[PDB]
Design an enzyme around this catalytic site. Structure first.
Site, PDB file in Angstrom:
ATOM      1  N   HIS A 110      34.438  37.206  37.030  1.00 23.14           N
ATOM      2  CA  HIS A 110      35.252  38.290  37.117  1.00 23.14           C
ATOM      3  C   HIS A 110      34.422  39.497  36.665  1.00 23.14           C
ATOM      4  O   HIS A 110      34.708  40.412  35.821  1.00 23.14           O
ATOM      5  CB  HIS A 110      36.569  38.288  36.200  1.00 23.14           C
TER       6      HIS A 110
ATOM      7  N   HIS B  31      32.169  40.132  42.410  1.00 27.60           N
ATOM      8  CA  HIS B  31      33.549  39.749  42.673  1.00 27.60           C
ATOM      9  C   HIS B  31      34.149  41.126  43.243  1.00 27.60           C
ATOM     10  O   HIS B  31      34.834  40.649  44.294  1.00 27.60           O
ATOM     11  CB  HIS B  31      34.316  39.209  41.318  1.00 27.60           C
TER      12      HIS B  31
ATOM     13  N   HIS C  72      40.217  45.948  41.027  1.00 25.92           N
ATOM     14  CA  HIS C  72      41.165  45.128  40.687  1.00 25.92           C
ATOM     15  C   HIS C  72      41.067  44.267  39.514  1.00 25.92           C
ATOM     16  O   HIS C  72      42.311  43.672  38.856  1.00 25.92           O
ATOM     17  CB  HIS C  72      41.757  44.276  42.033  1.00 25.92           C
TER      18      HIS C  72
END
Ligand SMILES: Cc1cccc(Oc2nc(N3CCN(c4ccccn4)CC3)nc3[nH]cnc23)c1
Ligand SMILES: [Mg+2]
Ligand SMILES: [Zn+2]
Length: 314
Positions: free
Chosen positions: A69, A73, A107
């Protein structure tokens, strides 16, 4: 700007247009790859270069050095969206093209390598502030924070109206990355598609469809060429097995997916994931946006590679 077109070496210029593109190991090329995607996806006019660069570098700074993460990514998920938007030129609004590449870059902002479940069981303060979609409300919160830094307002030219609409696209898009919400979203989209009630003029329908694009982009490791898919799964499991260790430290048997002592069960676990999540995701997406079909094909190729792993053919 404004006669200052970003350009990539030939191999990248061509392969960036393809769904299965891997952005490569050169971290310092990722910002330029993203700007390239914004310019082609949106326009060289959509954002002020200086503001966009300052935004990108502040977003990068606010991803952590976790196995999966991470900043790579963020850029990987933005690229899958770029491929969807470019293959579906005329389906998306000017505000949508703007909001969605940004939503994807942002995100997982400030992700710590831990699930909503872990935060709730640890009793992390973020779990008291945000009772559901805990990390996703956090990620949206960090996105607004960075937008409000001096010289970081990439949306400065929009009216008060359009600014509120684009921040609302970003918020819904980021919230949709909570996989717990995906199953119901996709079930509704399937029923809508198959009773022919799906209507892209219904804002509430557009929202669902964007949610599905967000899941699709977020899971896109399963749509790469097998060596990328396989080496990405290793990073994913490095995070999960760390969480599993932390669960065991709170006195809680983790689920097998997070138990490094249950490594042997990975291949059978991947089969379930492709069957229960990935294939249904890309299938419904392809039904609504036929040009996204290469994601579904690439996903099915990877299911077949995991079936060979099980048969000891690798
Ligand atoms: C591409 C990708 C890679 C790794 C993890 C991943 O996310 C996930 N994988 C799975 N399945 C995968 C694998 N699982 C097992 C089981 C025993 C041992 C190892 N793995 C079992 C469910 N289920 C999930 N629910 C939410 N997220 C999941 C995705
Ligand atoms: Mg996330
Ligand atoms: Zn993500």
């Amino acid at each position: 700007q404004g006669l200052m077109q970003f350009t990539l070496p030939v191999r990248l210029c061509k392969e960036i247009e393809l769904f299965h593109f891997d952005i490569g190991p050169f971290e310092n090329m990722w910002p330029g790859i993203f700007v390239y995607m914004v310019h082609r996806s949106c326009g060289t006019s959509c954002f002020e270069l200086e503001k966009l660069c300052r935004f990108i570098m502040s977003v990068k700074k606010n991803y952590r050095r976790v196995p999966y993460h991470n900043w790579k990514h963020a850029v990987t998920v933005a690229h899958c969206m770029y491929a969807i938007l470019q293959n579906n030129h005329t389906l998306f609004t000017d505000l949508e093209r703007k909001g969605l590449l940004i939503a994807c870059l942002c995100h997982d902002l400030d992700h710590r390598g831990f699930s909503n479940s872990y935060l709730q069981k640890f009793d992390h303060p973020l779990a008291a502030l945000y009772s559901t979609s805990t990390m996703e409300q956090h990620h949206f919160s960090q996105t607004v924070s960075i937008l409000q830094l001096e010289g970081h307002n990439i949306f400065s030219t929009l009216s008060s109206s359009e600014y509120e609409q684009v921040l609302e696209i970003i918020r819904k898009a980021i919230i949709a990355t909570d996989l717990a919400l995906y199953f119901g979203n996709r079930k509704q989209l399937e029923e809508m598609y198959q009773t022919g009630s799906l209507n892209l003029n219904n804002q509430s329908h557009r929202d669902r469809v964007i949610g599905l694009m967000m899941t699709a982009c977020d899971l896109c490791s399963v749509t790469k060429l097998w060596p990328v898919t396989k080496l990405t799964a290793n990073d994913i499991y490095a995070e999960f097995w760390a969480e599993g260790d932390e669960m065991k430290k709170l006195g809680i048997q983790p689920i097998p997916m997070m138990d490094r002592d249950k490594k042997d069960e990975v291949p059978q676990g991947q089969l379930g994931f492709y069957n229960a999540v990935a294939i249904p995701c890309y299938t419904t997406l392809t039904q609504i946006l036929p040009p996204t079909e290469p994601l579904l094909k690439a996903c099915r190729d990877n299911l077949s590679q995991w079936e060979k792993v099980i048969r000891g053919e690798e």
